[PDB]
């Protein structure tokens, strides 16, 4: 629908997001993902950390270099699980994953562009309350992604910038709504409502 989709990854879950993404890629929508320090995974911190140390101890015992890379960072985690969801060895796969771009935080140029969500992956719908979740920023900094305090600063910069922006947009909508409702009660408006607008 949109040529370039820009997901916000906050409030979301990995697997469910990953599945919907992978299918959208294999059908071709160029998809981009942000804020993936603030993803969520089910379960508790310690279960997820035990898991990841297990993946971390997996290594090629004859030469440790050439085997399973324990990518620490969040975006590349998400990429990992997605690479499991895809046939990454073949060309349909590779020309899927060249339709994917993962970032942390939000760089430009997408902050000036629209962000979306997924319904059917979100924590806040999908999880029963009284049940734990795990911020990937906390997790990955616990396991050796040494950039977390940076991105919070930059996102804090972005947030005020967007704040001033929304103030402008709001005032503009205020004026425009007043203008349109004052222009309403014209017969053309009556006819529009007659036709359902």
């Amino acid at each position: 629908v949109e040529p370039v989709v820009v997901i916000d990854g906050k409030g979301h879950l990995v697997g469910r997001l990953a599945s919907v993404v992978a299918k959208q890629l294999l059908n071709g929508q160029k998809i981009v993902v942000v804020r993936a320090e603030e993803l969520n995974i089910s379960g508790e911190f310690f279960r997820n950390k035990l898991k990841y140390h297990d993946f971390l101890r997996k290594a090629t015992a004859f030469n440790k270099t050439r085997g399973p890379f324990h990518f620490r960072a969040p975006s590349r985690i998400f990429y990992k699980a997605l690479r499991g969801m895809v046939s990454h060895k073949t060309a349909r796969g590779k020309a899927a994953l060249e339709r994917l771009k993962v970032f942390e935080g939000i760089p430009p140029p997408y902050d000036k562009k629209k962000r979306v969500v997924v319904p059917q992956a979100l924590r806040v719908l999908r999880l029963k309350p009284g049940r734990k979740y795990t911020t990937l920023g906390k997790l990955s900094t616990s396991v050796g992604w040494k950039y977390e305090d940076v991105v919070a600063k930059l996102e804090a910069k972005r947030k005020v910038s967007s704040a001033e922006y929304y103030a402008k947009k709001r005032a503009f909508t205020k004026k425009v709504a007043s203008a349109n409702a004052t222009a309403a009660e014209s017969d053309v408006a009556k006819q529009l409502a007659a036709l359902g607008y």
């Binding site: 035990l50 140390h53 297990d54 101890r57």
Partner: protein, 36 residues
């Protein structure tokens, strides 16, 4: 920590068919006993 080795949950077929043959032995023994 040092997160230690797991047992799998993988199928490992010899144990499946060993289970089936063991099961039939168990049920045979049950029928040999069940007259009493």
């Amino acid at each position: 920590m040092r997160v230690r080795k797991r047992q799998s949950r993988r199928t490992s077929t010899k144990l499946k068919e060993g289970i089936k043959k063991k099961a039939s032995a168990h049920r045979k023994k049950e029928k040999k006993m069940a007259k009493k």
